[PDB]
Amino acid sequence: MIQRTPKIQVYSRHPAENGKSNFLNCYVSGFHPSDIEVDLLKNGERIEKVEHSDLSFSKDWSFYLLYYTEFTPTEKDEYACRVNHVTLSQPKIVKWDR
Amino acid sequence: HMTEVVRHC
Amino acid sequence: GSHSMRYFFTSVSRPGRGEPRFIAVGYVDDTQFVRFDSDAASQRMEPRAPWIEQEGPEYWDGETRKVKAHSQTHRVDLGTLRGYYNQSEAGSHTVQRMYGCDVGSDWRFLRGYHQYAYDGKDYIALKEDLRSWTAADMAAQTTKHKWEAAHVAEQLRAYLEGTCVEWLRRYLENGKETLQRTDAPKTHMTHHAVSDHEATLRCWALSFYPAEITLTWQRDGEDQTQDTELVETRPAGDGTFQKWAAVVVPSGQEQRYTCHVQHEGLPKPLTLRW
Protein backbone atom coordinates (compact mmCIF):
# COMPACT_ATOMS: atom_id res chain seq x y z
CA MET A 1 0.00 0.00 0.00
CA ILE A 2 1.51 3.30 -1.25
CA GLN A 3 -0.51 6.50 -0.97
CA ARG A 4 0.17 9.89 -2.61
CA THR A 5 -1.72 13.13 -2.12
CA PRO A 6 -3.18 14.81 -5.26
CA LYS A 7 -2.07 18.08 -6.85
CA ILE A 8 -4.79 20.62 -7.62
CA GLN A 9 -5.04 23.16 -10.42
CA VAL A 10 -8.07 25.45 -10.84
CA TYR A 11 -8.39 27.29 -14.17
CA SER A 12 -10.65 27.94 -17.19
CA ARG A 13 -10.71 26.16 -20.56
CA HIS A 14 -10.36 29.46 -22.55
CA PRO A 15 -9.06 32.96 -21.63
CA ALA A 16 -11.71 34.30 -19.24
CA GLU A 17 -13.63 37.35 -20.51
CA ASN A 18 -16.60 38.52 -18.36
CA GLY A 19 -19.92 37.72 -20.09
CA LYS A 20 -18.43 35.12 -22.47
CA SER A 21 -19.28 31.45 -22.11
CA ASN A 22 -16.45 29.25 -20.84
CA PHE A 23 -15.54 26.15 -18.85
CA LEU A 24 -14.20 26.01 -15.29
CA ASN A 25 -11.72 23.16 -14.64
CA CYS A 26 -10.33 21.47 -11.56
CA TYR A 27 -7.54 19.07 -12.49
CA VAL A 28 -6.57 16.61 -9.79
CA SER A 29 -3.58 14.33 -10.41
CA GLY A 30 -0.86 12.20 -8.80
CA PHE A 31 -3.13 10.66 -6.23
CA HIS A 32 -3.53 7.13 -4.99
CA PRO A 33 -5.77 5.45 -4.19
CA SER A 34 -8.31 6.41 -6.82
CA ASP A 35 -11.21 7.36 -4.59
CA ILE A 36 -11.43 11.13 -4.37
CA GLU A 37 -14.07 13.80 -3.78
CA VAL A 38 -14.04 16.88 -6.01
CA ASP A 39 -16.56 19.73 -6.00
CA LEU A 40 -16.60 23.07 -7.81
CA LEU A 41 -17.93 26.03 -5.82
CA LYS A 42 -19.50 29.38 -6.71
CA ASN A 43 -19.14 31.88 -3.87
CA GLY A 44 -18.85 28.90 -1.51
CA GLU A 45 -21.81 26.81 -2.73
CA ARG A 46 -21.68 23.52 -4.67
CA ILE A 47 -22.33 23.56 -8.44
CA GLU A 48 -24.89 20.96 -9.43
CA LYS A 49 -24.07 20.06 -13.02
CA VAL A 50 -20.46 18.81 -12.94
CA GLU A 51 -18.98 16.16 -15.23
CA HIS A 52 -15.61 14.44 -15.03
CA SER A 53 -13.18 12.46 -17.14
CA ASP A 54 -12.90 8.64 -17.14
CA LEU A 55 -10.35 7.41 -14.56
CA SER A 56 -6.84 7.01 -15.93
CA PHE A 57 -3.34 6.97 -14.45
CA SER A 58 0.34 7.84 -15.11
CA LYS A 59 3.57 5.89 -15.48
CA ASP A 60 3.52 6.59 -11.72
CA TRP A 61 0.46 4.39 -11.38
CA SER A 62 -1.00 7.52 -9.79
CA PHE A 63 -4.45 8.64 -11.02
CA TYR A 64 -5.82 11.83 -12.55
CA LEU A 65 -9.29 13.24 -13.27
CA LEU A 66 -10.68 16.38 -14.80
CA TYR A 67 -13.78 17.92 -13.24
CA TYR A 68 -15.38 20.63 -15.33
CA THR A 69 -18.58 22.68 -15.78
CA GLU A 70 -19.97 25.42 -18.00
CA PHE A 71 -19.99 28.95 -16.62
CA THR A 72 -20.02 32.61 -17.56
CA PRO A 73 -17.59 34.57 -15.34
CA THR A 74 -18.63 37.88 -13.73
CA GLU A 75 -16.83 40.75 -11.96
CA LYS A 76 -18.13 39.65 -8.51
CA ASP A 77 -18.32 35.82 -8.66
CA GLU A 78 -15.46 33.85 -7.09
CA TYR A 79 -14.91 30.18 -7.89
CA ALA A 80 -13.15 27.39 -6.02
CA CYS A 81 -12.52 23.60 -6.03
CA ARG A 82 -12.97 21.36 -2.99
CA VAL A 83 -11.04 18.16 -2.78
CA ASN A 84 -11.00 15.36 -0.22
CA HIS A 85 -8.83 12.24 -0.12
CA VAL A 86 -7.56 9.72 2.49
CA THR A 87 -4.18 11.50 2.39
CA LEU A 88 -5.70 14.80 3.58
CA SER A 89 -6.23 15.87 7.21
CA GLN A 90 -9.13 18.07 6.09
CA PRO A 91 -10.57 18.78 2.61
CA LYS A 92 -8.46 21.31 0.68
CA ILE A 93 -10.02 24.34 -1.04
CA VAL A 94 -8.26 25.96 -4.00
CA LYS A 95 -9.61 29.33 -5.20
CA TRP A 96 -9.63 30.18 -8.92
CA ASP A 97 -7.27 33.06 -9.99
CA ARG A 98 -7.54 34.74 -13.40
CA HIS B 1 -8.10 -3.05 -30.03
CA MET B 2 -7.51 -4.96 -26.81
CA THR B 3 -5.56 -8.16 -26.48
CA GLU B 4 -7.10 -11.62 -26.02
CA VAL B 5 -4.74 -12.47 -23.10
CA VAL B 6 -6.52 -12.37 -19.71
CA ARG B 7 -4.78 -15.08 -17.65
CA HIS B 8 -5.27 -15.07 -13.87
CA CYS B 9 -2.39 -13.85 -11.83
CA GLY C 1 6.91 11.70 -35.30
CA SER C 2 6.27 8.65 -33.23
CA HIS C 3 2.96 7.39 -31.92
CA SER C 4 1.47 5.18 -29.28
CA MET C 5 -1.52 3.14 -28.26
CA ARG C 6 -2.20 2.55 -24.58
CA TYR C 7 -4.85 0.78 -22.49
CA PHE C 8 -5.33 1.62 -18.76
CA PHE C 9 -7.28 -0.76 -16.50
CA THR C 10 -8.28 -0.16 -12.86
CA SER C 11 -10.02 -2.65 -10.52
CA VAL C 12 -10.86 -1.48 -6.99
CA SER C 13 -12.35 -3.89 -4.44
CA ARG C 14 -15.13 -2.58 -2.17
CA PRO C 15 -15.89 -5.06 0.70
CA GLY C 16 -19.53 -5.14 1.73
CA ARG C 17 -20.47 -3.09 -1.35
CA GLY C 18 -20.84 -6.08 -3.71
CA GLU C 19 -18.72 -6.33 -6.86
CA PRO C 20 -15.40 -4.52 -7.54
CA ARG C 21 -15.31 -1.30 -9.63
CA PHE C 22 -13.55 -1.74 -13.01
CA ILE C 23 -12.61 1.13 -15.40
CA ALA C 24 -10.86 0.80 -18.73
CA VAL C 25 -9.68 3.47 -21.15
CA GLY C 26 -7.87 3.46 -24.46
CA TYR C 27 -5.65 6.16 -25.92
CA VAL C 28 -3.85 6.95 -29.06
CA ASP C 29 -1.05 9.39 -28.05
CA ASP C 30 -2.82 11.97 -25.90
CA THR C 31 -6.40 11.37 -27.16
CA GLN C 32 -8.84 8.96 -25.46
CA PHE C 33 -11.04 6.96 -27.81
CA VAL C 34 -12.75 4.23 -25.80
CA ARG C 35 -14.05 3.60 -22.28
CA PHE C 36 -15.75 1.03 -20.13
CA ASP C 37 -17.43 1.59 -16.70
CA SER C 38 -18.72 -1.43 -14.73
CA ASP C 39 -21.09 0.99 -12.87
CA ALA C 40 -22.42 2.68 -16.10
CA ALA C 41 -25.74 1.47 -17.58
CA SER C 42 -24.56 0.43 -21.06
CA GLN C 43 -22.42 -2.50 -20.04
CA ARG C 44 -20.61 -2.01 -23.36
CA MET C 45 -17.31 -0.61 -24.60
CA GLU C 46 -18.23 3.03 -25.46
CA PRO C 47 -16.65 5.36 -28.12
CA ARG C 48 -14.96 8.63 -26.90
CA ALA C 49 -13.56 9.94 -30.14
CA PRO C 50 -15.48 10.72 -33.37
CA TRP C 51 -13.26 8.55 -35.66
CA ILE C 52 -13.69 5.28 -33.71
CA GLU C 53 -17.33 5.40 -34.80
CA GLN C 54 -16.10 4.16 -38.24
CA GLU C 55 -15.80 0.74 -36.60
CA GLY C 56 -18.40 -1.91 -37.34
CA PRO C 57 -20.77 -3.81 -34.98
CA GLU C 58 -18.31 -6.79 -34.77
CA TYR C 59 -15.75 -4.36 -33.43
CA TRP C 60 -18.04 -3.24 -30.62
CA ASP C 61 -19.16 -6.82 -29.95
CA GLY C 62 -15.51 -7.96 -29.77
CA GLU C 63 -14.24 -5.06 -27.61
CA THR C 64 -17.10 -5.45 -25.11
CA ARG C 65 -16.54 -9.25 -24.96
CA LYS C 66 -12.79 -8.73 -24.23
CA VAL C 67 -13.27 -5.83 -21.77
CA LYS C 68 -15.68 -7.94 -19.77
CA ALA C 69 -13.07 -10.78 -19.78
CA HIS C 70 -10.44 -8.28 -18.44
CA SER C 71 -12.85 -7.29 -15.66
CA GLN C 72 -13.63 -10.90 -14.84
CA THR C 73 -9.95 -11.76 -14.59
CA HIS C 74 -9.27 -8.65 -12.44
CA ARG C 75 -12.11 -9.63 -10.19
CA VAL C 76 -10.38 -13.04 -9.58
CA ASP C 77 -6.95 -11.26 -9.10
CA LEU C 78 -8.19 -9.05 -6.19
CA GLY C 79 -8.98 -12.30 -4.35
CA THR C 80 -5.80 -14.03 -5.46
CA LEU C 81 -3.61 -11.12 -4.35
CA ARG C 82 -5.35 -10.76 -0.95
CA GLY C 83 -4.15 -14.39 -0.48
CA TYR C 84 -0.63 -13.89 -1.79
CA TYR C 85 -0.17 -10.95 0.66
CA ASN C 86 -2.20 -12.52 3.54
CA GLN C 87 -4.34 -9.42 3.79
CA SER C 88 -7.70 -8.97 5.44
CA GLU C 89 -11.02 -9.16 3.54
CA ALA C 90 -11.99 -5.78 5.04
CA GLY C 91 -9.63 -3.27 3.34
CA SER C 92 -10.05 -1.86 -0.20
CA HIS C 93 -7.30 -2.87 -2.72
CA THR C 94 -6.41 -1.83 -6.25
CA VAL C 95 -5.23 -3.69 -9.35
CA GLN C 96 -3.94 -1.72 -12.34
CA ARG C 97 -2.77 -3.03 -15.71
CA MET C 98 -1.40 -1.09 -18.71
CA TYR C 99 -0.26 -2.35 -22.11
CA GLY C 100 0.26 -1.09 -25.69
CA CYS C 101 2.86 -0.31 -28.42
CA ASP C 102 5.07 2.62 -29.60
CA VAL C 103 5.79 3.11 -33.33
CA GLY C 104 8.41 5.52 -34.74
CA SER C 105 8.01 8.13 -37.46
CA ASP C 106 7.91 5.34 -40.05
CA TRP C 107 4.97 3.81 -38.11
CA ARG C 108 6.94 0.65 -37.28
CA PHE C 109 7.24 -1.27 -34.04
CA LEU C 110 9.60 0.39 -31.58
CA ARG C 111 8.54 -0.80 -28.12
CA GLY C 112 5.85 -2.83 -26.38
CA TYR C 113 4.87 -2.98 -22.73
CA HIS C 114 2.57 -4.95 -20.37
CA GLN C 115 2.82 -4.28 -16.62
CA TYR C 116 0.75 -4.85 -13.46
CA ALA C 117 0.41 -2.89 -10.22
CA TYR C 118 -0.98 -3.84 -6.84
CA ASP C 119 -1.94 -1.04 -4.35
CA GLY C 120 0.20 1.64 -5.94
CA LYS C 121 3.39 -0.24 -6.68
CA ASP C 122 4.70 -2.65 -9.30
CA TYR C 123 3.64 -6.22 -9.11
CA ILE C 124 4.77 -7.89 -12.40
CA ALA C 125 5.82 -6.70 -15.83
CA LEU C 126 6.96 -7.95 -19.21
CA LYS C 127 10.58 -7.00 -19.99
CA GLU C 128 11.54 -5.03 -23.08
CA ASP C 129 12.44 -8.23 -24.98
CA LEU C 130 8.77 -9.29 -24.55
CA ARG C 131 9.84 -12.88 -23.73
CA SER C 132 10.46 -12.82 -19.96
CA TRP C 133 8.96 -11.45 -16.78
CA THR C 134 10.20 -9.16 -14.02
CA ALA C 135 8.62 -10.02 -10.66
CA ALA C 136 8.79 -6.99 -8.32
CA ASP C 137 8.18 -9.27 -5.30
CA MET C 138 8.80 -12.68 -3.87
CA ALA C 139 4.97 -12.76 -4.05
CA ALA C 140 4.93 -11.94 -7.78
CA GLN C 141 7.18 -14.99 -8.53
CA THR C 142 4.19 -17.29 -8.08
CA THR C 143 2.27 -15.37 -10.79
CA LYS C 144 5.36 -15.40 -13.01
CA HIS C 145 5.59 -19.16 -12.70
CA LYS C 146 1.99 -19.66 -13.81
CA TRP C 147 2.38 -17.41 -16.88
CA GLU C 148 5.66 -19.11 -17.80
CA ALA C 149 3.82 -22.42 -17.82
CA ALA C 150 0.95 -21.20 -19.96
CA HIS C 151 3.20 -19.41 -22.55
CA VAL C 152 1.51 -16.05 -21.88
CA ALA C 153 4.61 -14.10 -22.95
CA GLU C 154 4.55 -15.57 -26.47
CA GLN C 155 0.87 -14.61 -27.02
CA LEU C 156 1.47 -11.12 -25.57
CA ARG C 157 4.39 -10.66 -27.98
CA ALA C 158 2.41 -11.64 -31.00
CA TYR C 159 -0.11 -8.98 -29.83
CA LEU C 160 2.39 -6.19 -29.05
CA GLU C 161 4.50 -6.72 -32.21
CA GLY C 162 1.55 -7.48 -34.52
CA THR C 163 -2.05 -6.75 -33.68
CA CYS C 164 -1.16 -3.68 -31.55
CA VAL C 165 0.74 -1.84 -34.26
CA GLU C 166 -1.63 -2.90 -37.04
CA TRP C 167 -4.57 -1.36 -35.28
CA LEU C 168 -2.56 1.73 -34.20
CA ARG C 169 -1.79 2.45 -37.84
CA ARG C 170 -5.44 1.95 -38.72
CA TYR C 171 -6.59 4.53 -36.16
CA LEU C 172 -3.99 7.02 -37.37
CA GLU C 173 -5.38 6.72 -40.88
CA ASN C 174 -8.99 6.88 -39.82
CA GLY C 175 -8.57 9.88 -37.49
CA LYS C 176 -5.89 11.64 -39.60
CA GLU C 177 -7.60 15.06 -39.12
CA THR C 178 -7.54 14.72 -35.34
CA LEU C 179 -4.58 12.46 -34.54
CA GLN C 180 -2.00 13.68 -37.05
CA ARG C 181 -2.61 17.41 -36.49
CA THR C 182 -0.29 19.74 -34.67
CA ASP C 183 -1.66 22.74 -32.81
CA ALA C 184 1.29 25.05 -31.82
CA PRO C 185 1.04 26.71 -28.39
CA LYS C 186 -0.32 30.21 -28.19
CA THR C 187 2.33 31.99 -26.10
CA HIS C 188 2.38 35.08 -23.91
CA MET C 189 4.13 36.35 -20.72
CA THR C 190 2.65 38.02 -17.63
CA HIS C 191 4.01 40.21 -14.82
CA HIS C 192 2.91 40.44 -11.16
CA ALA C 193 4.65 42.43 -8.47
CA VAL C 194 5.26 40.47 -5.24
CA SER C 195 7.07 43.21 -3.30
CA ASP C 196 8.92 46.39 -4.26
CA HIS C 197 11.97 44.13 -4.74
CA GLU C 198 10.70 41.12 -6.62
CA ALA C 199 8.48 40.36 -9.60
CA THR C 200 6.93 37.12 -10.90
CA LEU C 201 7.27 36.50 -14.65
CA ARG C 202 4.97 33.77 -15.97
CA CYS C 203 5.36 32.27 -19.43
CA TRP C 204 2.16 30.69 -20.80
CA ALA C 205 1.57 27.94 -23.35
CA LEU C 206 -2.09 27.33 -24.19
CA SER C 207 -4.20 25.24 -26.57
CA PHE C 208 -1.49 22.96 -27.88
CA TYR C 209 -1.44 19.35 -29.16
CA PRO C 210 0.23 16.91 -28.68
CA ALA C 211 0.67 17.21 -24.93
CA GLU C 212 4.42 17.11 -24.97
CA ILE C 213 6.11 20.56 -24.62
CA THR C 214 9.18 22.05 -22.89
CA LEU C 215 9.29 25.41 -21.09
CA THR C 216 12.65 26.69 -19.79
CA TRP C 217 13.91 29.99 -18.32
CA GLN C 218 17.21 31.59 -19.31
CA ARG C 219 18.95 34.53 -17.64
CA ASP C 220 21.49 36.31 -19.93
CA GLY C 221 21.45 33.29 -22.30
CA GLU C 222 22.29 30.86 -19.49
CA ASP C 223 19.87 28.15 -18.28
CA GLN C 224 18.02 29.42 -15.22
CA THR C 225 16.41 26.98 -12.78
CA GLN C 226 16.64 28.61 -9.33
CA ASP C 227 13.57 30.52 -7.99
CA THR C 228 11.45 29.11 -10.84
CA GLU C 229 8.18 27.18 -10.78
CA LEU C 230 6.67 24.83 -13.37
CA VAL C 231 3.15 23.30 -13.15
CA GLU C 232 2.15 19.86 -14.45
CA THR C 233 0.73 19.94 -18.00
CA ARG C 234 -3.03 20.14 -17.67
CA PRO C 235 -5.97 19.23 -19.97
CA ALA C 236 -8.04 22.19 -21.30
CA GLY C 237 -11.20 20.10 -21.86
CA ASP C 238 -11.28 20.40 -25.71
CA GLY C 239 -8.40 17.99 -26.56
CA THR C 240 -5.63 20.65 -26.21
CA PHE C 241 -3.25 21.20 -23.30
CA GLN C 242 -1.90 23.99 -21.09
CA LYS C 243 1.24 24.68 -19.01
CA TRP C 244 3.00 27.64 -17.45
CA ALA C 245 6.43 28.29 -15.89
CA ALA C 246 7.28 31.19 -13.52
CA VAL C 247 10.44 32.86 -12.24
CA VAL C 248 11.00 35.38 -9.44
CA VAL C 249 13.35 38.19 -10.51
CA PRO C 250 14.76 41.37 -8.83
CA SER C 251 12.98 44.66 -9.72
CA GLY C 252 14.59 46.36 -12.70
CA GLN C 253 16.10 43.03 -13.88
CA GLU C 254 13.12 41.74 -15.92
CA GLN C 255 14.86 42.22 -19.29
CA ARG C 256 17.64 39.79 -18.43
CA TYR C 257 15.15 36.93 -18.58
CA THR C 258 13.79 34.81 -21.45
CA CYS C 259 11.24 32.06 -21.75
CA HIS C 260 11.99 29.27 -24.24
CA VAL C 261 9.20 27.08 -25.69
CA GLN C 262 9.87 23.85 -27.65
CA HIS C 263 6.94 22.01 -29.26
CA GLU C 264 6.37 19.70 -32.24
CA GLY C 265 4.40 22.67 -33.65
CA LEU C 266 7.26 25.17 -33.31
CA PRO C 267 9.92 24.30 -35.96
CA LYS C 268 11.98 27.16 -34.52
CA PRO C 269 11.71 27.32 -30.67
CA LEU C 270 10.14 30.59 -29.40
CA THR C 271 11.97 33.10 -27.26
CA LEU C 272 9.76 35.43 -25.24
CA ARG C 273 11.00 38.49 -23.28
CA TRP C 274 9.08 40.98 -21.16
Side-chain angles (χ1 to χ4, degrees), chain A residues 1-4 7-15 23 25 27-35 51-58 60-66 68 97-98, chain C residues 7-10 12 21 23-25 27 32 34-37 48 87 94 96-98 115-124 206 230-238 242 244:
Chain A
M1 199 254 258
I2 303 292
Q3 313 192 139
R4 333 188 103 100
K7 318 183 183 199
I8 303 169
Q9 294 187 61
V10 195
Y11 56 103
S12 53
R13 169 178 309 171
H14 306 288
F23 280 88
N25 294 330
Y27 182 53
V28 297
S29 73
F31 54 99
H32 215 288
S34 59
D35 200 282
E51 304 169 76
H52 65 78
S53 55
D54 298 313
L55 193 58
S56 194
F57 58 81
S58 299
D60 252 2
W61 310 109
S62 84
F63 303 95
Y64 54 96
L65 286 175
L66 176 67
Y68 62 102
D97 178 8
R98 311 163 157 271
Chain C
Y7 278 97
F8 302 92
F9 302 87
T10 299
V12 182
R21 182 88 174 264
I23 309 221
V25 303
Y27 272 93
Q32 193 210 343
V34 280
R35 79 178 279 183
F36 179 84
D37 196 326
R48 287 302 250 159
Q87 300 164 329
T94 305
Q96 289 165 276
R97 156 160 93 142
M98 179 277 296
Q115 48 186 80
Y116 263 83
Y118 190 61
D119 290 331
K121 59 232 177 45
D122 294 334
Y123 174 77
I124 192 170
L206 303 166
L230 177 85
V231 288
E232 179 192 336
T233 288
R234 74 193 186 186
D238 53 6
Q242 299 175 10
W244 64 256

Side-chain angles (χ1 to χ4, degrees), chain C residues 55-57 59-81 83-88 90-104:
Chain C
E55 283 317 323
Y59 175 89
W60 301 103
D61 292 348
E63 296 311 289
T64 308
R65 181 171 48 69
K66 299 191 278 192
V67 85
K68 292 184 179 150
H70 281 46
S71 184
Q72 278 325 282
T73 288
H74 283 190
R75 192 221 85 215
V76 182
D77 300 344
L78 282 166
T80 312
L81 280 224
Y84 290 181
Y85 285 108
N86 302 109
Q87 300 164 329
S88 169
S92 172
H93 297 273
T94 305
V95 177
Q96 289 165 276
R97 156 160 93 142
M98 179 277 296
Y99 63 65
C101 46
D102 303 350
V103 306

